[PDB]
Symmetry: C3
Subunit: 331 residues, 3 copies
């Protein structure tokens, strides 16, 4: 929904309402919880044409919970020059999300390893991102990004980070996409004080393949982290980071013409060398679900998580299944 178009400036307002309910046994010990999870979104996107070759842009988006959970998701501005690329700064996706966003396609769940405020894998504040598409207008399909992560010292370890760099490479050909991304940063003094996880530097990287054509969507991600994945020991009420993780995400979806979109997926996340515990799974589930698209504005969906986590998990990660049911209006 555009609200302004004059002097080469465009503004688009957008938002959605999501009525959303989670079902689990009784649901402290489930994958997703139990109860109401309804929320709304509001944001704008602006693009201004400064000259023939240069464009300016900003974007904001907020999450309002309708059930705590109220969050800015995007807040950034930047410039794009003809074939040199684009620069922007703000709260934006980490560059490793260039890989991980390949499998972030399920109706409600999925994307379990794209934590917010976790350096590079997800929704993070204070990142400057240089981006180049089709490699200086020379090689169509080939894209790359480099990103500087500013130091964020905050009250909790979970949401803090030090100075860091990362980058991504992508190639997109005949309906396929392959991607690799890597990032490293300093850990804050407070993080290194935490019980779990130890090391001066944190690191995250992932690769990915996707196929997005002929009403099919199929994507696979492999990632590894060092000292970067936040974990909590629900038994001893201890927090920190996992020294190493190894994560696999697979998704397969097909889009029927009449608007039904079934989905199957798998997610497995394993921490290694966790202080006190050793090897323990963080995430392990299959997902079967479907979305029904009535049109570009309206949809409903059901998202079942068959949880492979064992009830005897040592970190006390929840072992029960959760199904989400959701109805969505967006503009």
């Amino acid at each position: 929904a555009e609200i302004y178009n004059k002097d080469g400036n465009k503004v688009d307002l957008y938002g959605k309402a999501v009525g959303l309910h989670y079902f689990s046994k009784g649901g402290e010990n489930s994958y997703g919880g139990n109860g109401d999870m309804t929320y709304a979104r509001l944001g704008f996107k602006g693009e201004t044409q400064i000259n023939s070759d240069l464009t300016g842009y900003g974007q904001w988006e907020y999450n309002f919970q309708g059930n705590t959970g109220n969050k800015t998701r995007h807040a950034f501005a930047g410039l794009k020059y003809a074939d040199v690329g684009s620069f922007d700064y703000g709260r934006n996706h980490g560059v490793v999300y260039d890989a991980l966003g390949y499998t972030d396609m399920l109706p409600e769940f999925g994307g379990d390893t794209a934590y917010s405020d976790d350096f590079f894998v997800g929704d993070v504040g204070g990142v400057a991102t240089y981006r180049n598409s089709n490699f200086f207008g020379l090689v169509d399909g080939l894209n790359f990004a480099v990103q500087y992560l500013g130091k964020n010292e905050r009250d909790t370890a979970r949401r803090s980070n030090g100075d860091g760099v990362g980058g991504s490479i992508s190639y997109e050909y005949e309906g396929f996409g392959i991607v690799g991304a890597y990032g490293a940063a300093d850990r804050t003094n407070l993080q290194e004080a935490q019980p779990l996880g130890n090391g001066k530097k944190a690191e995250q990287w992932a690769t990915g393949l996707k196929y997005d054509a002929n009403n099919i969507y199929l994507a696979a991600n492999y990632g590894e982290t060092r000292n970067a994945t936040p974990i909590t020991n629900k038994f001893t009420n201890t927090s920190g980071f996992a020294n190493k993780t190894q994560d696999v995400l697979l998704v397969a979806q097909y889009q029927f013409d009449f608007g039904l979109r079934p989905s199957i997926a798998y997610t497995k996340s394993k921490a290694k060398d966790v202080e006190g515990i050793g090897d323990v799974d963080l995430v392990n589930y299959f997902e079967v679900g479907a979305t029904y698209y009535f049109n570009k504005n309206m949809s409903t969906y059901v998202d079942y998580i068959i949880n492979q986590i064992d009830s005897d998990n040592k970190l006390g990660v929840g072992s029960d299944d959760t199904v989400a049911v959701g109805i969505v209006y967006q503009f």
Copy 2:
């Protein structure tokens, strides 16, 4: 204010600014308090036409305090089919508000028994509501709704609830409306732990008549609750629910052509079998007030509460008068 109209999708943005001040003696012991109460509202309403017979819709609205008090008020989406009715899920009005909203017409106050997060009587999160108007297109004026209330377990008893059902019937003829509504739900374990109120099931119901024609508005509500009205003993700092309440609300207003709209009202709420106290009034006042409408966008108002609560109230409910003065811009 519509911002989109193409492909049978409409989006309306709306909001208002309310400059608002309350006056009381000195005002801990007043009906309404004392000081600034200014606030703003923002929301959207969308409607998409899926086919000949089916429509999709969503709605969101937020309250921003300008003086804590920041709240989502509506967040829901749903579908409406030609003469079968409508279904929606989200944060919405309880179905008992179908009755109580008859007397919710005063400039600033009123509607004292339509608590938020109180099962069925007001603004509540996690409700699926089926609605039918003109009874399958057969009997004009006759409407009914049934509603399922999902279990909401939260940190305080006041804002939690268990699984529940409710319904409403309404008839609207020659300027009149009559309505009855009823709802029952399980109380959470935490609620039953509270000092005040005891019982496994909570219940609320109300009836109402209104006359809304010839520039007149006249409405009466009677309600009763069991184990559902939140009460606080300000003497002993004790909380819970009233075992029984009996509530009466009357309103009478006339709209002058030149934009003045005087208003008189009465509200009385009595709790019975309150643990330790017995019978005690929660609300007891007369209201005299007026709104001046300059047009569809601008208005000011004054709202005087003559408080009948006695200073010796045993729950320490406040006994002093409050007048509100308010100026409002809306679009």
Copy 3:
């Protein structure tokens, strides 16, 4: 960006995204801090034409932090009559900001003495403001305002205030503006309980000159306060108000045609008769900075604060420099 124009009602939606980073040594002991400070703004402005001579209006604006700091900035409505003036009530600027806003022109910093929730000098809630421009349509350039400040009793002393009055006079001629403003109010019981600052009445006043023409901007402010400037003793973790302050702000800026806008400024704030301390500076710095305007929608900026505060400051006010870098998209 206007979204409505029919029946003499106009609504303008507006907002901006600001990617913003502060740089300081290591930055507890700096002027501005250190890290990400990105934020977004959203607001509307409405104007309705009631009759030939009378107009209604409302305005709201919110600040969303993207890094706590989420705030309503404006929320008010009012009426303007042909040559009698205008009245409005809400969260608005104190009338002393009529003076202080002259020097509030730097890219990111500046305006250090226009505290929010500080009676009269800045962003304050619960003020009714009468305003008259060109003195009843008789003397072009000559303007005045009188303002009543309602009592705000809150949990902290810093953000509370009692009943008060203030006013301002302004003259604007051939590119110049001169202004004087004054305000006085009661201090709340809680404020008078604080360690620092003592007196029953608080007072603030300031004068100002500005020159705003030929691509130049030049402004000077002098102010004094009594018992109104909030100060904190970071050594002993003590709070309150300064018994007296004396504040000077100077700014000089030039706007190049091609969009560069260099800026130099000076700010000095001195508290006197501070309980335990005596005479101590609160603010003391030079600013050199520049903004680059690409157009009416896009801009970037750098803002350097050369901090004159001494490391041996007795209130433990921070002594290090801070440079801000920022990119801005607005509509």
